[PDB]
Amino acid sequence: YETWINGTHGAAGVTCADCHMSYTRSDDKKKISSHWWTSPMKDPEMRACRQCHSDKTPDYLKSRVLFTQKRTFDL
Amino acid sequence: GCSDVSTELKTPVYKTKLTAEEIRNSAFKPEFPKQYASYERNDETTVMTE
Amino acid sequence: GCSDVSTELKTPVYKTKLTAEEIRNSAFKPEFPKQYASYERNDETTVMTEYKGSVPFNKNDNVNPLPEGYRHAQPYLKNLWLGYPFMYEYREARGHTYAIQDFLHIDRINRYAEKGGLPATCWNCKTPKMMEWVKESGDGFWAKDVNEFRDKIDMKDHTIGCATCHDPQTMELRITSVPLTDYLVSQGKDPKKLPRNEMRALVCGQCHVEYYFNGPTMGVNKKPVFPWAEGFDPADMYRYYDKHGDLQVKGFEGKFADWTHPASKTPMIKAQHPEYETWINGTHGAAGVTCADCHMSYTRSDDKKKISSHWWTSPMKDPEMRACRQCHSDKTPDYLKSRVLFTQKRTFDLLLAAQEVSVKAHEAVRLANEYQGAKAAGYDDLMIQAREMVRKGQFFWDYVSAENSVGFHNPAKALDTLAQSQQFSQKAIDLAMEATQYGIGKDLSGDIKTIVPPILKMNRKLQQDPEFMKTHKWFQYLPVLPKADQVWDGQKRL
Amino acid sequence: AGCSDVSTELKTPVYKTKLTAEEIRNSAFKPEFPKQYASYERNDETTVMTEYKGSVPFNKNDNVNPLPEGYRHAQPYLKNLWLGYPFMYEYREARGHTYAIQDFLHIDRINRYAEKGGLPATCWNCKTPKMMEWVKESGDGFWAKDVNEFRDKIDMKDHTIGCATCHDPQTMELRITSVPLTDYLVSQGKDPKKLPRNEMRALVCGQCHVEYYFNGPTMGVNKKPVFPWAEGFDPADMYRYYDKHGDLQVKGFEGKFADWTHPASKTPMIKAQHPEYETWINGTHGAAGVTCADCHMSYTRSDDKKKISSHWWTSPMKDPEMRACRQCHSDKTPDYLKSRVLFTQKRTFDLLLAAQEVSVKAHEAVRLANEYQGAKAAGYDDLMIQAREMVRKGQFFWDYVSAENSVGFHNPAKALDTLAQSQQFSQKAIDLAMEATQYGIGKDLSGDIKTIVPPILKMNRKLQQDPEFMKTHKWFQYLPVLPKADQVWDGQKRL
Amino acid sequence: FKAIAGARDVYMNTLGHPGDLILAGMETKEVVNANCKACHTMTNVEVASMEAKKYCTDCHRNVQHMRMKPISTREVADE
Ligand code: HEC
Ligand code: HEC
Ligand code: HEC
Ligand code: HEC
Ligand code: HEC
Ligand code: HEC
Ligand code: HEC
Ligand code: HEC
Ligand code: HEC
Ligand code: HEC
Ligand code: HEC
Ligand code: HEC
Ligand code: HEC
Ligand code: HEC
Ligand SMILES: CCCCCCCc1cc(O)c2ccccc2[n+]1[O-]
Ligand SMILES: [Ca+2]
Ligand SMILES: [Ca+2]
Ligand SMILES: [Ca+2]
Ligand SMILES: [Ca+2]
């Protein structure tokens, strides 16, 4: 919570539920809220990200996540 | 001529059969089987990201 | 008032800057960066579904963890492929982009001599460089040694790539396979005038099929041929192998064999990845549901516009099963997964079982081959009938085993076929016993895993160690290989 | 021309008959529901045949004689496999619901050569809406009476499996009148009066089209019908059910259930019966919620211009146009559809025939081992138990599929998978009977099994009275020669 | 089109005898698929989705009035 609140996403109103409970059209084509609380990176189509970042490909998004993770972990 | 928008978008309002202090997960299953099936996906324990 | 549909849907027409014989993958990248990026997803090699995935683990290894083995393996493979190149190494199939890397790392091709011991025909479903090689050597290409092209190929730029399927100029769909063209012609169909929905299967049918090589007396020496003239089912291919071949062994005159099993002395057929022939009359294929429909489904990754996924992998890697969810928009991804596993679990379990009884069959024939007591008066004729059944059973289970869908492509066929395999293997055991007047029985009593233990470790290197070729009873049917240093490490020479 | 919107509700029409709460006579529903009744009467057709099924009640073990006696697709070994059990006397292809009581009164499985049928009144349980009065009249005590007691206390045409079995006589609401199904539903925490429409469109058939068993005297209410479903709906589950619920005192089978013992192999057996429901529930249609009613009772406009549910319960394959399937599979042609059914059925029937051959071989192996006179293995006894156990498991497995009426179509993968397992078990039996006799029995198990144990084509209660005929098959030495007796019952007439 | 289909539908509902199966005729399969194209062009601009199957609905199966779903979710008897 305390990490997220002033992070590039939280600062702009982007919410845990926005990413970890994204809408998914699994009931015919109707939205329900994903109650699968896990890594957004398990979905190879990064669909949770892909309304807000509809101009980037899933792989582009993955590479931008790893850009941060790899430096952070190593440090 | 008339509209064809005969179903208007409304914020869902819910009223369950459950008592005010219900805590048992399995009591939620019958009224919300979709969210439940999604909740059950958390039992997956073999996938690693990076 | 006017229309607002100012962009009309049209079928895309392409005209590239590329020359008519272009084969290099990297030449395709500038004009189609979207499909290319999708093509590059095949480099992912860490994700397993339940029975499949892109980790190239050893398919006979249910012992060591990933990446060496896995919980779903076939422990008996090496026993069953004794004396045949598949006993050295056989791993889970992975992304197309790895085709040449893995081809040149496999121990099946000999790397302890100059000669590979296998025909250049091995290159057939690996590289679009096949077009020049044939244009240059003609009918003479196939019979050359595989290792002769080992160092004349770009591992990244010449793997199964765009030219395997597309015309480099127009991007139209092409069949570039020689053996597939051979069948299509034998059927009266024109490979340049084929209906789209057929193409969306045939492009994969270029390589994902059961094949064999002509022997010296069957036509062009070492040419690939799809055994399809009798139909697509196991019975049809087995009947095809009854009439096309070169065996001279009494009882099997005229029949084909990939090798003879050196323990049972049974003339064996080898099956490989018959996805096409399995799919064609399966619940999906029968109804015009195509490889491309599932493995190249449309994905809206370019803004919201469709492009065709060129990520050839398991549909089960996407937790939202989107490839399925237009046609089955009423079922949830999880529902679909559970229906896949409904077939897969039964099929895989039945496979292991069918494989055990096949080992038992081989073993029975081995004991009957060597028996010193009183034989029946029809011993010789019964040994043939026995070996005939060892061969038939193994083909049937190989047909299913070697097939990557694990039942899914054709549920009914897969299961049917394993059941018949069981009958055949067991009929062999029955015949082997009849012939020895049941004198072998005492040696077939326990669990098969005790009397013939599964062979976990075997490669061309170990087959050099005389100490090692003593550790298992079936190793006495193999020769001890001569001391040799490794000569080929990938593409370089040691 | 018209102006209010459709309803999302899908409200089923509501009825208020003139009938009393306890009305059970079929012909009482006629004047108020002529179109459904008309349709119900179409079950009287008994001449039309499909590839594997039909409405001709031929003898299911007869691939020798032509229709109506036999049929090209039959199971020649039935009588060998059910030696010493009533199903060895007669067993016919099922036909329309209107014939049920007539065919019950005609079957040779019920003793008609004595006063007592030798079988429990529970046999009526799925034949008549007379069940309700009878259970109300005699309570727990009903089931264990002889079956013949009610033989003449029923109207063959007016009291067959008609409307009252499924409909409340007053409101016409779908209803569950079965006691054994009610028992299961209650054990799951479900309310039979408050079930969703879709569930009922399957459960109404689920009242009868199942695998059942009777309680033995120490298992609870004596001869009461129970569905072995507590472990699940698959063969493996049902077999595990039968490991833990039963009365056997035979060494190595203690506590297990048995319907009879095979006189030849001395194997305590299970009989499976028509598990259409258990088969359909996790097959590709059932798991998707496509109910028996979708296929066997699809909507028809035939009459007038108004759509009713067809009450012609028969093979969906009788129809050249497959009209029923095509409410869903509208993109497929009728002949396409037929071909996909045959795909499953040919495979399933072919495999089934194989599994029965090997079942017979097993019985023969174990029979041989039982009477074997040479040097026995040190473990003879344990082996002989393990061997009997497999004969048992193997038979239940094929029986599960054989008795099932769709020939694999309701659940392709369960069927074929199950058949394959049947095979493995039956063979294991042989291997053990062989192990136990140090293979001295091999010499008697060599050829084609049809020349070692020939199919029993003929057998009924009358013939079992003839001692000359009883010397006609090697296996007849394990059955008694029945006392010479006159036919007591002819249908509903006492003689 | 409206007056022809209209006229033909009134006739079928009165003097004619409709079957157990109501199926779209060739002509209506055609005007429908055209209207698929009309509203979902941009999703499909870069992809020969038109050449694969005859009609869009050969993939988007349930846009055809949920044909795959159990009978009880679609239909009841008449009053
Ligand atoms: C009438 C008797 C038939 C026949 C002969 C078939 N169907 Fe159906 N079908 C339906 C659904 C929902 C599926 C699974 C696909 C999905 O989940 O959408 C199927 C599948 C089939 C198959 C292929 C499977 C197989 O094992 O062979 C076949 C050959 C088949 N069906 C034939 C839906 C329905 C219905 C909707 C309520 C109805 C009615 C039918 N099917 C009826 C029939
Ligand atoms: C509102 C404007 C519509 C639309 C869009 C449709 N209908 Fe009907 N229709 C009626 C009947 C009795 C039939 C069966 C005819 C037969 O047996 O072939 C139909 C059929 C259809 C179809 C399918 C056949 C075709 O290709 O046209 C379709 C797509 C269709 N209708 C659409 C009856 C009526 C009505 C009674 C007067 C009315 C009003 C409508 N339909 C209205 C509409
Ligand atoms: C205002 C109320 C909204 C309208 C109108 C639409 N949205 Fe959304 N949306 C969100 C996600 C994470 C998805 C993914 C769907 C999937 O699983 O594929 C969607 C989907 C849609 C779609 C389908 C669009 C497509 O083709 O991709 C439409 C037409 C749509 N939504 C309309 C997320 C959100 C969200 C974040 C919290 C909000 C506030 C909305 N959507 C709101 C609307
Ligand atoms: C595979 C065969 C196939 C064909 C043929 C096809 N589609 Fe699609 N369609 C798909 C798949 C798969 C998706 C999923 C794309 C995604 O979400 O990544 C899709 C998605 C769509 C969507 C987005 C709807 C959604 O789920 O959000 C639209 C709109 C669409 N298609 C329209 C059409 C039209 C119009 C046609 C005919 C001209 C057509 N499609 C033909 C398979 C097909
Ligand atoms: C971590 C907290 C959390 C838990 C635990 C949780 N949910 Fe939710 N749920 C949410 C949020 C956040 C929303 C949507 C927020 C909004 O109202 O916009 C939601 C939405 C819903 C909705 C509305 C329909 C929809 O899809 O949006 C239902 C119904 C629901 N949840 C049921 C359940 C059920 C059933 C469970 C347990 C099995 C559950 N929830 C567990 C946080 C949770
Ligand atoms: C007619 C087509 C075809 C021919 C001919 C062919 N292959 Fe393959 N190969 C395939 C296909 C399809 C796959 C992926 C499917 C699979 O392995 O199950 C594959 C996978 C492989 C792999 C990686 C998987 C493994 O076994 O570890 C190797 C290595 C390989 N082939 C080498 C060979 C060799 C050696 C030969 C000659 C003996 C050969 N190929 C002949 C089609 C072919
Ligand atoms: C030129 C021959 C060729 C063609 C054409 C071809 N394949 Fe392959 N395929 C192979 C070979 C070889 C491999 C194994 C590569 C390896 O493991 O190194 C393979 C691997 C695969 C895999 C393994 C993917 C994974 O990640 O596990 C899939 C799936 C597959 N092929 C499907 C297809 C489909 C679908 C098509 C049609 C679009 C197709 N193939 C066309 C030869 C071919
Ligand atoms: C194994 C076969 C195969 C290979 C390899 C392959 N494609 Fe394709 N490609 C297809 C199929 C199938 C389609 C769909 C065409 C259709 O439905 O008519 C397609 C479609 C396309 C299209 C048309 C636009 C679209 O997405 O439908 C382009 C452009 C394309 N591929 C480029 C490439 C490039 C670049 C490569 C190499 C990096 C490549 N393809 C590799 C089979 C293949
Ligand atoms: C109806 C959908 C469908 C069709 C049609 C289809 N496949 Fe599949 N394929 C699947 C599914 C589902 C799996 C199993 C995925 C798993 O278990 O991980 C699979 C498995 C495979 C695999 C193994 C994937 C891996 O991880 O190694 C290959 C290779 C393959 N199919 C190739 C083909 C070929 C070639 C064709 C055409 C002959 C074809 N498929 C037709 C859906 C389909
Ligand atoms: C009261 C018990 C009972 C109920 C309820 C019941 N069945 Fe039957 N069914 C039977 C019996 C008993 C027979 C055997 C009658 C005979 O062979 O003479 C039979 C025969 C059949 C036949 C064969 C008819 C033929 O023409 O070949 C079909 C089909 C059938 N049932 C299906 C159904 C369906 C569908 C339902 C649900 C709507 C259903 N049953 C409900 C007991 C029942
Ligand atoms: C998806 C369609 C479908 C469903 C659902 C279905 N059936 Fe059937 N049924 C068939 C078909 C097809 C046959 C094969 C008939 C033949 O061989 O001619 C069949 C066969 C039968 C038969 C034998 C018919 C005869 O000629 O005697 C009976 C009885 C039966 N089913 C009962 C049931 C019951 C009970 C259920 C529910 C649990 C059920 N069916 C569900 C389609 C269906
Ligand atoms: C074996 C079960 C069974 C039997 C016997 C049976 N019905 Fe039905 N009945 C059903 C089912 C299932 C429906 C469909 C109900 C639904 O869709 O909700 C139905 C529907 C009906 C309906 C509602 C209108 C319609 O057509 O959907 C009426 C009225 C009806 N039946 C009357 C009768 C009559 C009269 C008889 C005796 C001749 C009879 N039923 C026998 C199971 C049965
Ligand atoms: C008058 C109709 C209309 C209005 C207004 C409209 N849309 Fe759409 N929308 C459509 C249609 C039609 C499509 C599908 C076109 C296609 O498949 O290419 C679509 C597609 C979409 C998509 C998928 C394509 C994309 O660009 O992401 C999204 C998301 C969407 N609409 C959301 C919205 C939002 C948010 C707004 C408000 C700014 C909006 N729509 C306004 C009709 C409309
Ligand atoms: C999204 C487009 C769409 C809309 C909107 C739509 N339908 Fe349909 N309709 C279809 C499709 C697709 C078919 C089947 C076409 C075929 O046979 O290829 C169809 C077929 C039909 C049929 C007979 C064929 C069948 O499968 O039942 C009728 C009747 C019909 N439509 C009427 C209506 C009526 C009335 C409405 C308004 C409530 C409506 N449609 C709304 C797409 C639509
Ligand atoms: C003179 C024009 C006014 C008459 C309007 C008729 C309305 C009408 C009636 C129908 O039954 C239809 C069935 C299918 C398609 C369109 C249909 N339209 O438009
Ligand atoms: Ca793989
Ligand atoms: Ca081969
Ligand atoms: Ca019948
Ligand atoms: Ca029973």
PDB file of C-alpha atoms and ligand atoms in Angstrom, chain A residues 18 22-25 31 47 51, chain C residues 300 304, ligand 3:
ATOM      1  CA  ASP A  18      -7.475  -1.713 -11.680  1.00  0.00           C
ATOM      2  CA  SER A  22      -9.281  -6.133 -13.892  1.00  0.00           C
ATOM      3  CA  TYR A  23     -12.474  -6.639 -15.774  1.00  0.00           C
ATOM      4  CA  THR A  24     -12.541  -9.816 -17.826  1.00  0.00           C
ATOM      5  CA  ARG A  25     -15.237 -10.848 -20.257  1.00  0.00           C
ATOM      6  CA  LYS A  31     -17.535  -8.082 -17.804  1.00  0.00           C
ATOM      7  CA  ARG A  47      -5.036  -7.634 -20.985  1.00  0.00           C
ATOM      8  CA  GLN A  51      -7.021  -0.668 -22.305  1.00  0.00           C
TER       9      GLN A  51
ATOM     10  CA  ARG C 300      -6.028  -7.759 -31.288  1.00  0.00           C
ATOM     11  CA  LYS C 304      -7.508  -3.097 -31.373  1.00  0.00           C
TER      12      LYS C 304
HETATM   13  C1  HEC F   3     -17.779   3.089 -19.319  1.00  0.00           C
HETATM   14  C2  HEC F   3     -18.644   2.674 -18.382  1.00  0.00           C
HETATM   15  C3  HEC F   3     -17.075   1.983 -20.107  1.00  0.00           C
HETATM   16  C4  HEC F   3     -17.425   1.511 -21.292  1.00  0.00           C
HETATM   17  C5  HEC F   3     -18.629   2.032 -22.106  1.00  0.00           C
HETATM   18  C6  HEC F   3     -16.482   0.440 -21.612  1.00  0.00           C
HETATM   19  N1  HEC F   3     -15.588   0.310 -20.569  1.00  0.00           N
HETATM   20 FE1  HEC F   3     -14.152  -1.183 -20.328  1.00  0.00          FE
HETATM   21  N2  HEC F   3     -12.691  -2.651 -20.161  1.00  0.00           N
HETATM   22  C7  HEC F   3     -11.756  -2.640 -19.135  1.00  0.00           C
HETATM   23  C8  HEC F   3     -10.948  -3.833 -19.216  1.00  0.00           C
HETATM   24  C9  HEC F   3      -9.781  -4.232 -18.278  1.00  0.00           C
HETATM   25  C10 HEC F   3     -11.492  -4.615 -20.417  1.00  0.00           C
HETATM   26  C11 HEC F   3     -10.962  -5.982 -20.929  1.00  0.00           C
HETATM   27  C12 HEC F   3     -12.047  -6.814 -21.592  1.00  0.00           C
HETATM   28  C13 HEC F   3     -11.481  -8.161 -21.941  1.00  0.00           C
HETATM   29  O1  HEC F   3     -11.396  -9.022 -21.018  1.00  0.00           O
HETATM   30  O2  HEC F   3     -11.113  -8.366 -23.137  1.00  0.00           O
HETATM   31  C14 HEC F   3     -12.571  -3.798 -20.935  1.00  0.00           C
HETATM   32  C15 HEC F   3     -13.367  -4.088 -22.014  1.00  0.00           C
HETATM   33  C16 HEC F   3     -14.255  -3.216 -22.578  1.00  0.00           C
HETATM   34  C17 HEC F   3     -14.748  -3.304 -23.932  1.00  0.00           C
HETATM   35  C18 HEC F   3     -14.298  -4.357 -24.973  1.00  0.00           C
HETATM   36  C19 HEC F   3     -13.215  -3.574 -25.732  1.00  0.00           C
HETATM   37  C20 HEC F   3     -12.247  -4.406 -26.521  1.00  0.00           C
HETATM   38  O3  HEC F   3     -12.584  -4.823 -27.655  1.00  0.00           O
HETATM   39  O4  HEC F   3     -11.120  -4.634 -26.015  1.00  0.00           O
HETATM   40  C21 HEC F   3     -15.588  -2.273 -24.126  1.00  0.00           C
HETATM   41  C22 HEC F   3     -16.367  -1.929 -25.412  1.00  0.00           C
HETATM   42  C23 HEC F   3     -15.672  -1.507 -22.895  1.00  0.00           C
HETATM   43  N3  HEC F   3     -14.833  -2.112 -21.966  1.00  0.00           N
HETATM   44  C24 HEC F   3     -16.450  -0.368 -22.726  1.00  0.00           C
HETATM   45  C25 HEC F   3     -11.601  -1.643 -18.195  1.00  0.00           C
HETATM   46  C26 HEC F   3     -12.462  -0.598 -17.927  1.00  0.00           C
HETATM   47  C27 HEC F   3     -12.349   0.314 -16.804  1.00  0.00           C
HETATM   48  C28 HEC F   3     -11.211   0.272 -15.758  1.00  0.00           C
HETATM   49  C29 HEC F   3     -11.416   0.292 -14.442  1.00  0.00           C
HETATM   50  C30 HEC F   3     -13.360   1.183 -16.872  1.00  0.00           C
HETATM   51  C31 HEC F   3     -13.667   2.349 -15.908  1.00  0.00           C
HETATM   52  C32 HEC F   3     -14.156   0.835 -18.030  1.00  0.00           C
HETATM   53  N4  HEC F   3     -13.578  -0.257 -18.662  1.00  0.00           N
HETATM   54  C33 HEC F   3     -15.293   1.490 -18.432  1.00  0.00           C
HETATM   55  C34 HEC F   3     -15.929   1.264 -19.628  1.00  0.00           C
END
